[PDB]
Amino acid sequence: QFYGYLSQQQNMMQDYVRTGTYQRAILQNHTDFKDKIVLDVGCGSGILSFFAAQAGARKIYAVEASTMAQHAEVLVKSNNLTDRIVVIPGKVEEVSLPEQVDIIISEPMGYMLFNERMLESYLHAKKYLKPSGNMFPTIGDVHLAPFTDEQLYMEQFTKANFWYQPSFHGVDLSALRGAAVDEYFRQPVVDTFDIRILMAKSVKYTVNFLEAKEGDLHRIEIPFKFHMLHSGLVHGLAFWFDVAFIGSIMTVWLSTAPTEPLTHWYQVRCLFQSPLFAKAGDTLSGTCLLIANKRQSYDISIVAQVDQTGSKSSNLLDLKNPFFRY
Amino acid sequence: YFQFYGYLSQQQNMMQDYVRTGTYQRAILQNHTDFKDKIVLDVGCGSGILSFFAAQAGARKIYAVEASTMAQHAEVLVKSNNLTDRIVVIPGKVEEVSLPEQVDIIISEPMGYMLFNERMLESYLHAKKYLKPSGNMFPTIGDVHLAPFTDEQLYMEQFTKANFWYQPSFHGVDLSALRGAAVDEYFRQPVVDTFDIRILMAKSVKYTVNFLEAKEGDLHRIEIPFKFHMLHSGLVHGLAFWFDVAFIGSIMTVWLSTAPTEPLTHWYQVRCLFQSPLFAKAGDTLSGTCLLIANKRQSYDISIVAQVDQTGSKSSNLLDLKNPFFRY
Ligand SMILES: CCc1ccncc1CNCCCCSC[C@H]1O[C@@H](n2ccc3c(N)ncnc32)[C@H](O)[C@@H]1O
Ligand SMILES: CCc1ccncc1CNCCCCSC[C@H]1O[C@@H](n2ccc3c(N)ncnc32)[C@H](O)[C@@H]1O
């Protein structure tokens, strides 16, 4: 229902970097839309389907599982486009298209790209794509980089140490302190930061939406080896994402990087249980394993070590309970 | 819900409300004779804090019932506080568990926004199947207060939002057909924040639920009639709601107030705007009905009808306590 509120649709429609970038990607690639058949997966209010119609699309199937499909239908009648935009209420996995499409368009990106698991519906929809058909967005780049943030690490313990007291109104809470720390460290942090907390150049993990299958997103293994630019304590990994619309005329990027004006995706940070001392020139190696979970999110398993010392840390986070710290 | 209250962070958030936790402890300890050597039921005990207060008051036995995974953390604190002989955590819904015996007193903190939100009072009232005749409830009564308010800033903040949907060319697209649906959605949102008491245009009307007498089914449909003698002239933008609970013990009555004349709590106050404000004069009477109907989303469909009796000026709103506006 969350996406079923006009207020929620307004917040994303009003977001210029999101909505304006999609319009630019589509209108500046008019040859990928001029007289084509289009699928808009999770169209919400239908704004992306209108942009395709502005670019000259012959037919646009606009699929929406929420009751927003009803409001999208009103906008298409109201905009005199019932001949070119057909709104199909229901799940993209369960509806019927009358024909194969030239191009699929969607805004399925969650926090850290993968959160909400909508990329699975986007990829599922390629059963409707013509061989040599296009995907907008075409690729997603997930960037991860080690960060130092003593204050963000220490505040976990400030919060958890609420339980480390022998007489909260006469009650010894101290037996729960360990569980409270564990629960706080299992929360990915959604907020932004100064790029100078980054201790190494990002590693990039690329999903090619033309090639990737639905099941590819159930388990995402991101090996990393960071060459440390700075000496300090590594508190965790920072995550962001770019997507590219690779059209016939040009590639348009939507970036959520900390070097770009802040978006409503912010960036995501996952703390280590224990920070790792690295000197500039050291290598920090390990694996980030994203495992799709039953709460339309991911279990995040990180293991990392400073190769030169053998110092090792890990964390297990659930992207379903993020801490909005902004 | 059985997830949300399942987080230690959420338990810490609530325990850290000192007015909430301190008033509960004061109600129980200053009424220790209502607990001493008695059998207690704590409905939805979370971390177990009210069961500990009952144990401090000298309760012989306390059944602490909890549906969420928080039940396991409560059992850890009962062992670490050496009260295994006094507090018995019973995992599950108070509707579906068996207790070995009837209780002298039920305790709970089941109050949501506007008292009724989250519909936990139904489980609190259900629990009375376990209450001995001449058993007590803590809290014993809930007083819902409503008063008409004026707030032009608040009214316009919300029209500033809906008028997004009046645009006939948003990136070339005509949104105006949805203007009506947007206004209704935005004005369905109860506003959760505090305010200065000088925005109130009349003395509050009080609606009293007696938890000793009420039946679970009584909370499916709640009809609150009101008649305000207006003390100021101006635009009524809606009704402000708050609530007190009273712990009516054998030694004293202790009140927990979320009144705007009182220290702020995590309950704040709740305002239900009218789509069109009502002009009234000092001395006019503003009457009508707040009707609360229980929905499948563990909440209420709220209908408010209000009229200035002297003019026939009448206003409506439907409100969706499922989609509050947290303005604070
Ligand atoms: C906070 C991240 C963020 C930050 C900034 N700006 C935006 C965002 C959110 N980006 C989109 C994430 C993806 C969320 S779902 C997008 C749309 O798809 C619909 N749906 C859901 C399932 C489904 C299905 N199987 N078949 C068809 N439709 C389906 C939803 O009802 C919704 O309208
Ligand atoms: C901070 C004050 C505040 C301010 C603003 N708004 C809300 C609040 C919270 N006030 C309590 C509302 C009541 C929330 S539920 C309270 C506890 O009861 C548990 N449960 C739920 C159903 C149930 C059942 N059938 N049988 C036993 N247990 C049950 C929950 O798992 C939870 O631990």
XYZ file of C-alpha atoms and ligand atoms in Angstrom:
720
model
C 0.000 0.000 0.000
C 3.032 2.348 0.752
C 3.321 3.135 -3.059
C -0.537 3.196 -3.086
C -0.560 6.765 -1.568
C -0.716 9.832 -3.883
C 1.568 11.502 -1.275
C 4.231 8.793 -1.903
C 3.837 9.243 -5.729
C 4.196 13.066 -5.306
C 7.456 12.680 -3.273
C 9.056 10.656 -6.179
C 7.389 12.752 -8.980
C 8.611 15.961 -7.152
C 12.164 14.507 -6.890
C 13.810 16.326 -9.894
C 17.035 14.197 -10.086
C 14.966 10.948 -10.302
C 12.055 12.162 -12.475
C 14.067 14.653 -14.594
C 16.814 12.066 -15.304
C 14.218 9.496 -16.473
C 12.604 12.168 -18.769
C 16.075 13.108 -20.253
C 17.101 9.417 -20.678
C 13.816 8.770 -22.616
C 13.364 12.064 -24.650
C 17.071 12.249 -25.738
C 16.750 8.541 -26.873
C 13.505 9.158 -28.917
C 14.677 6.617 -31.591
C 14.399 3.821 -28.933
C 10.723 4.927 -28.350
C 9.458 6.500 -31.663
C 6.672 4.027 -32.811
C 7.797 1.195 -30.393
C 5.857 -1.108 -27.983
C 6.790 -0.270 -24.314
C 6.350 -2.073 -20.950
C 6.407 0.146 -17.787
C 6.935 -2.286 -14.860
C 5.425 -0.903 -11.569
C 4.296 2.347 -13.298
C 2.785 3.900 -10.130
C 0.948 7.090 -11.255
C 2.250 6.328 -14.827
C 4.673 9.279 -15.212
C 7.325 7.109 -17.052
C 4.550 5.841 -19.471
C 3.698 9.542 -20.282
C 7.434 10.235 -20.972
C 7.481 7.257 -23.432
C 4.282 8.693 -25.081
C 6.081 12.111 -25.344
C 8.985 10.227 -27.080
C 6.486 8.824 -29.681
C 5.799 5.224 -28.420
C 2.981 3.487 -30.427
C 1.805 1.433 -27.396
C 2.763 1.417 -23.659
C 1.637 -1.366 -21.301
C 1.725 0.183 -17.771
C 1.578 -2.563 -15.067
C 0.950 -1.655 -11.394
C 0.128 -4.200 -8.617
C -1.161 -1.449 -6.179
C -4.521 0.528 -6.238
C -2.483 3.426 -7.766
C -3.307 1.604 -11.109
C -6.869 3.146 -10.717
C -5.380 6.695 -10.421
C -2.972 5.972 -13.342
C -6.090 5.004 -15.451
C -7.739 8.434 -14.565
C -4.573 10.321 -15.716
C -4.460 8.402 -19.105
C -8.209 9.147 -19.860
C -7.702 12.731 -18.554
C -4.569 13.085 -20.816
C -6.449 11.734 -23.959
C -4.042 8.732 -24.275
C -6.402 5.689 -23.874
C -5.364 4.739 -27.490
C -1.556 4.586 -26.608
C -1.337 3.792 -22.808
C -3.090 0.644 -21.476
C -2.943 0.353 -17.646
C -2.899 -3.331 -16.536
C -3.725 -3.690 -12.796
C -1.852 -6.620 -11.139
C 1.617 -8.197 -10.716
C 3.935 -8.205 -13.820
C 4.366 -12.002 -13.037
C 0.556 -12.658 -13.251
C -0.882 -10.264 -15.929
C -1.061 -10.972 -19.728
C 0.443 -8.643 -22.377
C -1.141 -9.031 -25.872
C 2.347 -8.859 -27.564
C 6.162 -8.684 -27.049
C 7.716 -5.204 -26.424
C 10.765 -3.341 -27.894
C 11.800 -1.782 -24.531
C 11.084 -2.173 -20.786
C 11.209 0.927 -18.551
C 11.039 0.886 -14.724
C 12.166 2.717 -11.554
C 12.743 -0.432 -9.450
C 15.816 0.798 -7.433
C 15.833 0.555 -3.620
C 18.491 1.547 -1.046
C 21.854 0.083 -2.162
C 19.996 -0.623 -5.520
C 18.617 -4.095 -4.521
C 16.432 -3.281 -1.480
C 12.653 -3.995 -1.989
C 13.622 -6.774 -4.507
C 11.758 -4.996 -7.395
C 14.701 -5.685 -9.794
C 13.377 -9.336 -9.774
C 10.009 -8.150 -11.294
C 11.960 -5.937 -13.800
C 14.074 -8.959 -14.942
C 10.986 -11.327 -14.845
C 9.351 -8.917 -17.372
C 12.054 -9.795 -19.990
C 9.764 -12.784 -20.861
C 7.866 -9.983 -22.763
C 11.008 -8.480 -24.375
C 11.701 -8.971 -28.144
C 15.119 -10.515 -28.906
C 17.459 -7.455 -29.178
C 14.907 -5.443 -27.097
C 16.255 -2.774 -24.690
C 16.031 -2.149 -20.874
C 15.887 1.396 -19.305
C 17.727 1.349 -17.004
C 20.177 -0.949 -18.837
C 22.908 -1.514 -16.168
C 23.283 -0.951 -12.386
C 26.707 -0.285 -10.765
C 26.880 -0.978 -6.976
C 29.986 0.746 -5.482
C 31.399 -0.234 -2.056
C 34.305 1.470 -0.200
C 35.756 1.141 3.327
C 35.010 4.148 5.661
C 36.253 5.584 8.980
C 33.598 7.086 11.280
C 34.620 6.723 14.978
C 31.486 8.702 16.068
C 29.009 6.465 14.140
C 30.719 3.291 15.613
C 30.732 4.647 19.234
C 27.054 5.820 19.134
C 25.946 2.093 18.761
C 27.328 1.594 22.331
C 25.888 4.908 23.620
C 22.473 3.573 22.502
C 22.965 -0.082 23.624
C 24.432 0.953 27.063
C 20.866 2.019 28.067
C 20.602 -1.729 29.061
C 23.923 -1.715 31.088
C 22.462 -0.378 34.342
C 21.680 -2.290 37.548
C 18.526 -0.334 38.569
C 16.340 1.015 35.714
C 13.378 1.856 38.074
C 14.689 -1.045 40.281
C 15.374 -3.460 37.319
C 18.827 -4.789 36.319
C 18.687 -4.514 32.460
C 22.359 -5.578 31.952
C 21.624 -9.194 30.732
C 20.143 -7.690 27.475
C 23.088 -5.348 26.652
C 24.730 -7.906 24.268
C 21.426 -8.504 22.364
C 20.918 -4.688 22.110
C 24.434 -4.140 20.625
C 23.862 -7.066 18.176
C 20.468 -5.603 17.108
C 21.917 -2.066 16.480
C 24.912 -3.443 14.451
C 22.429 -5.506 12.298
C 20.912 -2.146 11.068
C 22.405 -0.640 7.867
C 22.722 3.172 8.217
C 20.907 5.297 5.594
C 22.458 8.814 5.488
C 25.241 10.756 3.712
C 28.873 11.611 4.579
C 31.868 13.695 3.482
C 33.832 11.714 0.802
C 37.029 12.177 2.951
C 35.769 9.424 5.386
C 36.421 6.932 2.500
C 39.686 5.079 3.027
C 39.931 3.497 -0.478
C 38.719 3.858 -4.087
C 35.357 2.060 -4.523
C 35.018 -1.510 -5.851
C 32.260 -1.684 -8.561
C 29.816 -4.625 -8.993
C 27.848 -4.307 -12.269
C 24.483 -5.941 -13.019
C 23.741 -5.964 -16.787
C 19.884 -5.915 -16.908
C 19.942 -7.168 -20.566
C 21.784 -10.382 -19.455
C 20.839 -10.939 -15.781
C 18.120 -13.460 -14.836
C 15.681 -13.013 -11.936
C 17.419 -15.785 -9.908
C 20.802 -14.014 -10.293
C 19.509 -11.427 -7.665
C 18.734 -14.058 -4.922
C 22.446 -14.363 -3.999
C 24.900 -11.545 -4.934
C 28.544 -12.278 -4.091
C 30.808 -9.149 -4.116
C 34.480 -10.067 -3.484
C 36.625 -6.997 -2.688
C 40.320 -6.182 -2.289
C 40.794 -2.515 -1.270
C 44.186 -0.819 -1.595
C 44.066 1.597 1.397
C 44.681 5.290 0.440
C 44.620 6.337 4.162
C 45.921 5.006 7.529
C 43.189 4.624 10.222
C 40.452 2.459 11.791
C 38.028 0.985 9.203
C 34.522 0.960 10.780
C 32.673 -0.551 7.787
C 31.722 -0.441 4.085
C 29.775 2.393 2.411
C 27.446 1.513 -0.522
C 25.942 3.570 -3.369
C 24.781 2.892 -6.979
C 24.594 4.450 -10.461
C 22.278 3.216 -13.227
C 22.797 3.908 -16.959
C 20.145 4.209 -19.706
C 22.187 3.007 -22.745
C 20.040 4.297 -25.645
C 20.814 4.395 -29.421
C 21.550 8.176 -29.238
C 23.320 8.349 -25.842
C 23.900 6.966 -22.326
C 22.173 8.944 -19.487
C 23.427 8.254 -15.877
C 21.453 8.496 -12.602
C 24.193 8.553 -9.865
C 23.583 8.268 -6.023
C 27.333 8.606 -5.347
C 28.547 10.712 -2.375
C 30.294 12.949 -5.025
C 26.848 13.816 -6.524
C 24.140 16.100 -5.059
C 22.309 14.080 -2.357
C 19.313 11.972 -3.584
C 16.400 10.297 -1.689
C 18.487 7.044 -1.948
C 21.215 8.715 0.206
C 24.046 6.142 0.737
C 24.068 2.975 2.956
C 26.762 2.100 5.518
C 27.243 -1.336 7.111
C 29.425 -1.289 10.290
C 31.951 -3.992 11.259
C 31.437 -5.563 14.752
C 35.116 -4.577 15.412
C 37.032 -1.983 13.354
C 40.280 -2.899 11.537
C 43.515 -0.830 11.656
C 44.906 -0.398 8.127
C 47.962 1.682 7.171
C 48.042 3.422 3.752
C 49.368 0.744 1.291
C 47.738 -2.174 3.209
C 45.059 -4.311 1.425
C 41.586 -4.968 2.968
C 40.171 -8.175 1.399
C 36.914 -10.098 1.869
C 33.408 -10.766 0.549
C 30.039 -8.958 0.737
C 27.258 -11.597 0.288
C 23.696 -10.268 -0.332
C 21.090 -13.035 0.291
C 17.443 -12.218 -0.663
C 15.232 -12.735 2.479
C 11.469 -13.301 3.029
C 10.956 -9.579 4.066
C 11.501 -8.225 0.442
C 15.088 -7.318 1.462
C 18.557 -8.851 1.914
C 20.647 -10.461 4.639
C 24.083 -8.815 4.173
C 27.072 -10.996 5.222
C 30.432 -9.137 5.253
C 33.841 -10.663 6.127
C 36.980 -8.534 5.839
C 40.644 -8.754 6.914
C 43.786 -6.600 6.716
C 46.007 -8.960 4.635
C 49.301 -7.572 6.102
C 48.264 -8.239 9.802
C 45.594 -11.029 9.556
C 43.212 -8.775 11.638
C 39.672 -9.927 10.748
C 36.087 -8.667 11.307
C 32.584 -9.519 10.127
C 28.953 -8.419 10.328
C 25.481 -9.781 9.451
C 22.949 -6.990 8.636
C 19.233 -7.027 7.652
C 18.460 -4.255 5.129
C 14.751 -4.604 6.225
C 15.472 -2.592 9.499
C 17.683 0.308 8.251
C 18.524 3.214 10.627
C 17.556 6.547 8.935
C 20.239 8.692 10.615
C 20.013 11.731 8.193
C 3.514 -5.203 15.203
C 4.709 -8.549 16.779
C 7.887 -7.465 14.805
C 7.902 -3.652 15.686
C 7.515 -4.215 19.505
C 9.958 -7.161 18.986
C 12.939 -4.672 18.735
C 14.950 -3.818 21.920
C 15.390 -0.278 20.402
C 11.563 0.162 20.420
C 11.393 -1.228 24.052
C 14.189 1.279 25.030
C 12.312 4.118 23.241
C 9.168 3.449 25.301
C 10.946 2.720 28.641
C 12.881 6.041 28.141
C 9.554 8.047 28.178
C 9.962 8.940 31.923
C 6.360 10.259 32.302
C 5.094 6.888 30.882
C 7.430 4.557 32.867
C 7.470 6.741 36.070
C 3.671 7.193 36.196
C 3.233 3.403 35.757
C 5.693 2.707 38.586
C 4.006 5.394 40.847
C 0.460 3.954 40.134
C 1.632 0.406 41.098
C 3.999 1.123 44.073
C 1.709 3.771 45.727
C -1.114 1.115 45.368
C 1.112 -1.761 46.664
C -1.877 -3.257 48.698
C -3.611 -3.876 45.298
C -0.521 -6.074 44.455
C 0.856 -7.464 47.789
C 0.430 -11.321 47.855
C -1.906 -11.003 44.804
C -2.054 -12.743 41.396
C -1.362 -10.324 38.452
C -1.751 -10.589 34.646
C 0.458 -8.229 32.510
C -1.080 -8.114 28.987
C 1.553 -7.581 26.234
C 4.407 -7.247 28.749
C 7.179 -6.528 26.167
C 10.550 -6.360 28.086
C 8.542 -7.113 31.298
C 8.903 -3.700 33.097
C 5.307 -3.519 34.549
C 5.668 -7.170 35.801
C 8.852 -6.043 37.669
C 6.908 -3.124 39.280
C 4.173 -5.598 40.373
C 6.956 -7.853 41.841
C 8.413 -4.770 43.668
C 4.868 -4.103 45.085
C 4.998 -7.729 46.529
C 2.799 -9.661 43.990
C 2.716 -13.431 44.831
C 2.579 -14.374 41.131
C 2.614 -12.375 37.833
C 1.729 -13.949 34.442
C 3.475 -11.808 31.798
C 1.905 -12.553 28.362
C 3.664 -11.429 25.147
C 2.982 -12.390 21.482
C 6.291 -11.029 20.014
C 9.813 -12.583 20.261
C 10.365 -9.947 23.054
C 8.970 -12.733 25.364
C 12.447 -14.468 25.308
C 14.226 -11.195 26.380
C 11.702 -10.692 29.194
C 12.525 -14.286 30.425
C 16.286 -13.386 30.384
C 15.590 -10.344 32.666
C 13.345 -12.444 35.020
C 16.269 -14.959 35.527
C 18.998 -12.206 35.785
C 16.789 -10.339 38.386
C 16.273 -13.629 40.397
C 12.403 -13.372 40.171
C 11.854 -16.845 38.568
C 9.645 -17.690 41.653
C 7.343 -14.623 41.009
C 7.188 -13.691 37.255
C 6.125 -16.305 34.647
C 6.502 -15.211 30.982
C 3.751 -16.849 28.839
C 4.687 -16.525 25.122
C 1.742 -15.894 22.740
C -1.593 -14.021 22.339
C -3.598 -13.367 25.558
C -6.615 -14.710 23.465
C -4.996 -18.194 22.916
C -2.941 -19.009 26.122
C -4.062 -20.896 29.293
C -3.257 -19.390 32.733
C -3.268 -21.786 35.739
C -5.643 -19.507 37.765
C -7.773 -16.293 37.842
C -6.045 -12.958 38.699
C -6.710 -10.213 41.279
C -5.514 -7.469 38.857
C -4.670 -6.961 35.162
C -1.928 -4.479 34.090
C -1.113 -3.266 30.580
C 0.112 -0.295 28.559
C -2.227 -0.775 25.575
C -2.842 2.943 24.680
C -2.152 4.132 21.090
C -2.407 7.609 19.502
C -5.864 9.093 20.404
C -5.937 6.198 22.977
C -7.578 3.673 20.542
C -4.931 3.360 17.727
C -3.432 -0.200 17.264
C -6.637 -1.705 18.834
C -4.705 -3.306 21.801
C -7.493 -2.240 24.283
C -9.574 -5.173 22.751
C -6.869 -7.646 24.008
C -6.756 -5.830 27.415
C -10.595 -6.156 27.754
C -10.489 -9.790 26.383
C -8.027 -10.614 29.266
C -10.914 -10.011 31.771
C -12.019 -13.650 31.176
C -9.159 -14.260 33.744
C -10.227 -11.516 36.236
C -11.771 -12.549 39.608
C -15.092 -10.829 40.483
C -13.886 -7.690 42.404
C -10.638 -7.837 40.347
C -9.095 -4.509 39.259
C -7.674 -3.100 35.970
C -4.568 -0.788 35.840
C -5.312 1.386 33.972
C -8.988 1.495 35.132
C -10.512 4.233 32.867
C -9.519 6.203 29.768
C -10.760 9.796 29.217
C -10.572 10.944 25.572
C -10.548 14.791 25.381
C -11.533 16.665 22.216
C -11.462 20.486 21.731
C -11.856 22.574 18.535
C -8.689 24.415 17.463
C -7.623 27.185 15.054
C -4.328 26.791 13.050
C -4.045 28.503 9.610
C -0.343 27.469 9.188
C -1.342 23.742 9.604
C -4.391 23.950 7.238
C -2.219 25.613 4.478
C 0.833 23.266 4.919
C -1.636 20.471 3.805
C -3.261 22.467 0.927
C 0.363 23.375 -0.112
C 0.794 19.535 -0.505
C -2.540 18.616 -2.285
C -2.329 21.527 -4.820
C 0.625 19.630 -6.397
C -2.218 17.600 -8.016
C -3.896 20.760 -9.534
C -1.028 21.130 -12.147
C -2.295 20.797 -15.753
C 1.284 20.232 -17.158
C 3.687 18.526 -14.660
C 6.589 17.595 -17.040
C 3.899 17.853 -19.812
C 1.314 15.721 -17.856
C -2.147 16.900 -16.617
C -2.524 15.809 -12.936
C -5.699 17.964 -12.213
C -8.153 15.007 -12.535
C -6.582 13.637 -9.264
C -6.880 16.959 -7.286
C -10.022 15.676 -5.457
C -8.456 12.275 -4.567
C -5.223 14.028 -3.279
C -7.080 16.626 -1.069
C -9.157 13.746 0.477
C -5.997 11.595 1.074
C -3.983 14.461 2.703
C -6.965 15.627 4.871
C -7.590 11.944 5.919
C -4.186 12.109 7.761
C -4.440 12.741 11.525
C -1.676 15.251 12.503
C 0.529 13.857 15.353
C 2.406 16.752 17.080
C 2.020 19.172 20.031
C 0.716 22.769 19.993
C 0.213 25.820 22.274
C -3.027 25.537 24.355
C -4.011 29.078 23.051
C -5.031 27.478 19.651
C -8.004 25.822 21.529
C -11.319 27.722 21.061
C -13.386 25.844 23.716
C -13.093 23.724 26.896
C -12.561 20.024 25.967
C -15.406 17.435 25.892
C -14.484 14.228 27.827
C -15.513 10.700 26.691
C -14.866 8.013 29.381
C -14.218 4.284 28.659
C -14.452 2.289 31.949
C -12.161 -0.748 31.356
C -13.707 -2.447 34.442
C -17.153 -2.488 32.679
C -16.450 -2.248 28.902
C -16.602 -5.471 26.808
C -14.135 -6.206 23.953
C -16.937 -5.777 21.357
C -17.783 -2.251 22.721
C -14.602 -0.923 20.974
C -15.665 -2.030 17.414
C -17.876 1.125 17.167
C -17.177 4.200 19.388
C -19.628 7.117 19.090
C -18.423 10.367 20.712
C -21.143 13.064 20.761
C -19.825 16.623 21.498
C -21.275 20.093 22.282
C -18.684 22.939 22.643
C -19.554 26.362 24.133
C -17.109 28.473 22.045
C -14.923 30.872 24.169
C -13.301 32.606 21.110
C -14.472 33.750 17.613
C -12.596 32.412 14.538
C -12.113 29.557 12.017
C -12.303 26.040 13.558
C -9.692 24.100 11.493
C -10.640 20.812 13.276
C -10.690 18.892 16.602
C -7.595 18.264 18.804
C -7.609 14.929 20.739
C -5.696 13.732 23.801
C -6.316 11.241 26.651
C -5.717 10.570 30.339
C -5.764 7.103 31.904
C -6.525 6.756 35.655
C -5.146 3.923 37.835
C -7.951 3.792 40.459
C -6.296 1.830 43.292
C -7.335 1.120 46.893
C -4.815 3.788 48.199
C -4.953 6.529 45.493
C -5.931 7.369 41.919
C -2.814 8.067 39.766
C -3.292 9.768 36.365
C -1.170 9.528 33.247
C -2.121 12.623 31.130
C -1.087 13.277 27.490
C -2.911 16.681 27.770
C -1.232 19.639 25.993
C -1.106 21.374 29.507
C 1.180 18.472 30.597
C 4.786 17.410 29.880
C 5.100 16.014 26.317
C 4.892 12.180 25.875
C 5.508 9.841 22.867
C 1.663 10.080 22.396
C 1.944 13.851 21.628
C -1.576 15.010 20.624
C -3.636 14.263 17.456
C -5.490 16.850 15.334
C -8.153 15.905 12.734
C -8.496 18.829 10.231
C -11.750 19.800 8.437
C -11.461 20.081 4.601
C -13.290 23.455 5.036
C -12.842 25.370 8.339
C -15.937 26.581 10.321
C -16.443 30.230 11.374
C -17.941 30.429 14.905
C -18.510 33.342 17.381
C -17.682 33.239 21.151
C -20.907 31.922 22.812
C -21.961 29.827 19.759
C -22.303 26.028 20.257
C -20.360 23.582 17.989
C -21.936 20.083 18.151
C -21.575 16.803 16.257
C -20.231 13.245 16.447
C -16.779 11.653 16.331
C -17.485 8.036 15.174
C -14.593 5.473 15.373
C -15.125 2.187 13.397
C -12.503 -0.643 13.801
C -10.898 -1.686 10.422
C -8.835 -4.784 9.310
C -5.536 -2.715 9.568
C -5.539 -2.836 13.471
C -6.898 0.772 13.434
C -10.022 2.938 12.911
C -12.065 4.669 10.247
C -12.780 8.036 11.974
C -15.767 10.148 10.844
C -16.165 13.648 12.347
C -19.347 15.747 11.689
C -19.435 19.238 13.341
C -21.955 22.106 12.988
C -22.311 25.631 14.449
C -25.892 25.264 15.840
C -26.727 29.014 15.367
C -25.813 29.106 11.572
C -26.120 25.487 10.301
C -22.470 25.796 9.107
C -21.489 22.082 8.937
C -18.102 20.354 8.222
C -16.999 16.710 7.675
C -13.826 14.684 7.579
C -13.025 10.981 7.238
C -9.704 10.129 8.899
C -7.385 7.156 8.442
C -5.474 6.572 11.727
C -3.478 4.007 9.527
C -1.641 6.911 7.760
C -0.813 9.584 10.397
C 1.185 12.778 9.585
C 4.081 12.909 12.132
C 4.730 16.711 11.971
C 6.911 17.031 15.171
C 13.230 4.117 -1.070
C 13.983 4.032 -2.371
C 13.684 5.187 -3.295
C 14.417 6.354 -3.125
C 14.140 7.449 -3.922
N 13.172 7.464 -4.846
C 12.478 6.335 -4.998
C 12.688 5.168 -4.275
C 11.891 3.946 -4.642
N 12.271 3.391 -5.957
C 11.414 2.265 -6.379
C 11.678 1.001 -5.594
C 10.825 -0.212 -5.968
C 9.472 -0.245 -5.253
S 8.087 -1.013 -6.149
C 7.806 0.144 -7.518
C 6.380 0.031 -8.032
O 6.068 -1.338 -8.387
C 4.806 -1.676 -7.834
N 4.747 -3.132 -7.683
C 5.202 -3.861 -6.595
C 5.305 -5.169 -6.918
C 4.872 -5.292 -8.276
C 4.749 -6.320 -9.236
N 5.129 -7.573 -8.995
N 4.260 -6.025 -10.458
C 3.914 -4.763 -10.712
N 3.999 -3.700 -9.907
C 4.495 -4.012 -8.704
C 4.709 -0.869 -6.547
O 3.367 -0.790 -6.090
C 5.298 0.462 -7.018
O 4.290 1.302 -7.600
C 5.185 4.448 23.915
C 3.813 4.793 24.076
C 3.096 4.893 22.752
C 2.940 6.139 22.161
C 2.283 6.226 20.954
N 1.782 5.169 20.308
C 1.934 3.982 20.893
C 2.578 3.774 22.095
C 2.695 2.381 22.660
N 1.649 2.094 23.652
C 1.199 0.705 23.577
C 0.258 0.428 22.426
C -0.070 -1.105 22.303
C 0.911 -1.852 21.410
S 0.947 -3.658 21.656
C 1.661 -3.815 23.315
C 2.400 -5.135 23.450
O 1.423 -6.175 23.216
C 2.006 -7.182 22.427
N 0.901 -7.890 21.782
C 0.188 -7.499 20.655
C -0.954 -8.226 20.544
C -0.965 -9.142 21.657
C -1.823 -10.129 22.188
N -2.940 -10.519 21.569
N -1.471 -10.765 23.332
C -0.294 -10.471 23.885
N 0.619 -9.588 23.475
C 0.224 -8.925 22.377
C 2.982 -6.451 21.515
O 3.929 -7.355 20.956
C 3.582 -5.431 22.506
O 4.706 -5.999 23.186
